[PDB]
Design a protein around this motif. Sequence first.
Motif, PDB file in Angstrom:
ATOM      1  N   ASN A 218      46.863  51.081  50.640  1.00 47.23           N
ATOM      2  CA  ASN A 218      47.700  52.233  50.342  1.00 47.23           C
ATOM      3  C   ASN A 218      48.083  52.971  51.630  1.00 47.23           C
ATOM      4  N   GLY A 219      47.348  52.682  52.709  1.00 48.45           N
ATOM      5  CA  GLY A 219      47.371  53.478  53.916  1.00 48.45           C
ATOM      6  C   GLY A 219      46.311  52.976  54.880  1.00 48.45           C
ATOM      7  N   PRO A 220      46.210  53.520  56.117  1.00 47.44           N
ATOM      8  CA  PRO A 220      45.209  53.087  57.107  1.00 47.44           C
ATOM      9  C   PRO A 220      43.792  53.646  56.915  1.00 47.44           C
ATOM     10  N   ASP A 221      43.661  54.554  55.951  1.00 49.72           N
ATOM     11  CA  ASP A 221      42.390  55.164  55.633  1.00 49.72           C
ATOM     12  C   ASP A 221      41.575  54.208  54.767  1.00 49.72           C
ATOM     13  N   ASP A 222      42.246  53.269  54.101  1.00 44.06           N
ATOM     14  CA  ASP A 222      41.553  52.352  53.212  1.00 44.06           C
ATOM     15  C   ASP A 222      40.525  51.559  54.029  1.00 44.06           C
ATOM     16  N   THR A 223      39.371  51.311  53.408  1.00 47.95           N
ATOM     17  CA  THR A 223      38.257  50.644  54.067  1.00 47.95           C
ATOM     18  C   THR A 223      38.429  49.129  53.999  1.00 47.95           C
ATOM     19  N   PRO A 224      37.823  48.373  54.940  1.00 52.35           N
ATOM     20  CA  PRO A 224      37.849  46.906  54.880  1.00 52.35           C
ATOM     21  C   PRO A 224      37.349  46.356  53.540  1.00 52.35           C
ATOM     22  N   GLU A 225      36.193  46.861  53.087  1.00 47.71           N
ATOM     23  CA  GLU A 225      35.493  46.331  51.936  1.00 47.71           C
ATOM     24  C   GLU A 225      36.373  46.385  50.686  1.00 47.71           C
ATOM     25  N   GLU A 226      37.179  47.442  50.568  1.00 46.55           N
ATOM     26  CA  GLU A 226      37.947  47.676  49.356  1.00 46.55           C
ATOM     27  C   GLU A 226      39.273  46.916  49.387  1.00 46.55           C
ATOM     28  N   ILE A 227      39.777  46.642  50.606  1.00 48.35           N
ATOM     29  CA  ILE A 227      40.933  45.772  50.805  1.00 48.35           C
ATOM     30  C   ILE A 227      40.577  44.310  50.508  1.00 48.35           C
ATOM     31  N   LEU A 228      39.516  43.785  51.158  1.00 49.52           N
ATOM     32  CA  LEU A 228      38.944  42.482  50.820  1.00 49.52           C
ATOM     33  C   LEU A 228      38.639  42.375  49.315  1.00 49.52           C
ATOM     34  N   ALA A 229      38.153  43.453  48.723  1.00 48.24           N
ATOM     35  CA  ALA A 229      37.793  43.409  47.323  1.00 48.24           C
ATOM     36  C   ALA A 229      39.033  43.140  46.452  1.00 48.24           C
ATOM     37  N   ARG A 230      40.160  43.804  46.764  1.00 44.54           N
ATOM     38  CA  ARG A 230      41.410  43.647  46.035  1.00 44.54           C
ATOM     39  C   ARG A 230      42.028  42.265  46.289  1.00 44.54           C
ATOM     40  N   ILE A 231      41.913  41.764  47.521  1.00 45.09           N
ATOM     41  CA  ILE A 231      42.440  40.456  47.872  1.00 45.09           C
ATOM     42  C   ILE A 231      41.728  39.427  46.987  1.00 45.09           C
ATOM     43  N   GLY A 232      40.385  39.509  46.994  1.00 42.84           N
ATOM     44  CA  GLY A 232      39.505  38.689  46.175  1.00 42.84           C
ATOM     45  C   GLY A 232      39.756  38.767  44.667  1.00 42.84           C
ATOM     46  N   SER A 233      40.008  39.971  44.122  1.00 45.82           N
ATOM     47  CA  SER A 233      40.259  40.161  42.691  1.00 45.82           C
ATOM     48  C   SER A 233      41.413  39.286  42.218  1.00 45.82           C
ATOM     49  N   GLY A 234      42.369  39.050  43.131  1.00 40.31           N
ATOM     50  CA  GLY A 234      43.478  38.144  42.890  1.00 40.31           C
ATOM     51  C   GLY A 234      44.387  38.606  41.749  1.00 40.31           C
ATOM     52  N   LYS A 235      44.366  39.913  41.459  1.00 44.27           N
ATOM     53  CA  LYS A 235      45.406  40.503  40.636  1.00 44.27           C
ATOM     54  C   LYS A 235      46.152  41.532  41.489  1.00 44.27           C
ATOM     55  N   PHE A 236      47.387  41.832  41.055  1.00 46.17           N
ATOM     56  CA  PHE A 236      48.205  42.877  41.663  1.00 46.17           C
ATOM     57  C   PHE A 236      49.298  43.306  40.675  1.00 46.17           C
ATOM     58  N   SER A 237      49.746  44.551  40.857  1.00 40.03           N
ATOM     59  CA  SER A 237      50.817  45.094  40.056  1.00 40.03           C
ATOM     60  C   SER A 237      52.091  44.339  40.366  1.00 40.03           C
ATOM     61  N   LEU A 238      52.725  43.828  39.322  1.00 46.60           N
ATOM     62  CA  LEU A 238      54.117  43.457  39.435  1.00 46.60           C
ATOM     63  C   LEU A 238      54.856  44.205  38.335  1.00 46.60           C
ATOM     64  N   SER A 239      54.335  45.422  38.085  1.00 47.80           N
ATOM     65  CA  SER A 239      54.773  46.314  37.029  1.00 47.80           C
ATOM     66  C   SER A 239      54.823  47.738  37.560  1.00 47.80           C
ATOM     67  N   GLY A 240      55.858  48.497  37.172  1.00 50.20           N
ATOM     68  CA  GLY A 240      55.864  49.942  37.360  1.00 50.20           C
ATOM     69  C   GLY A 240      57.015  50.383  38.246  1.00 50.20           C
TER      70      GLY A 240
END
Length: 312
Positions: A218-240
């Motif tokens: 979302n921004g540069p404040d986001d932590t490594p762990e939570e970025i890796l976590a989202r990459i790993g989750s392998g879902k993303f919004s293609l809605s909204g």
Amino acid sequence: GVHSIVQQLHRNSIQFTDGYEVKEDIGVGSYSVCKRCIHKATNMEFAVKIIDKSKRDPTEEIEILLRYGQHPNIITLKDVYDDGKYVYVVTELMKGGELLDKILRQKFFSEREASAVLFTITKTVEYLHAQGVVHRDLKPSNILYVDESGNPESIRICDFGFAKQLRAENGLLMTPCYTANFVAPEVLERQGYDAACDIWSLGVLLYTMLTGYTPFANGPDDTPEEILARIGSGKFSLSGGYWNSVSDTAKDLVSKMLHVDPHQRLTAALVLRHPWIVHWDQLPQYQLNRQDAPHLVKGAMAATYSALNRNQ
């Protein structure tokens, strides 16, 4: 015990400062400094990357640039020197800025322009992959405009500093179509992977071009762990709000380029066969509904690549 022509550059009588004036910096780092230079004879300005030989050996980089710089959309080597301590890689200067940034500051950008941009970049990667080259740092900041024209002919892929020429035993350069010199199904999958990362990095670009935000930060404040976590989750919004308006063709391509499983992730070959690329003519020319936050995005983008490159 082959002769490398690059190794012998300290044999040159002429030096860099003999032919060129140096100017400001544009890209300091651990290993190298990038400065703007002026060519004394022509008053023509270039980029010069001044590398420290003690800190790394830039040969693999220079050999790739020599072989594949002739590509229209690949940064072009223009001179090179060695004084002992420092390798001076001179290339055309990218006056146009980073491509993503420029594009995100264009509020009337359309899908049709997006497809043209991806076509030009992915064409260039299809060629590299096809000669068993992988870029392996294909983040947005490494794709630049050589001028302010905003043509896709202006696009340049840059910094070949972590790129790999698929070699093999006897120190012998190979294609992906020929390795009858049976190479381990180990380091076919290394390169088989690093191809699909290049493609993933292109998915990140397309995602952000389309919406004005990166998919995993979302921004540069986001932590490594939570970025890796989202990459790993392998879902993303293609809605909204941002996506509602984008064609299903584009979303489809994005899903298969960022696909979490490398083995089901599209190739440059297959990207270029997708109707989003192929049927560009039937895409919309009217504006996208995007977040207008380019500098945020730049931070988010840096945060993402810093989490991926952390373990290295």
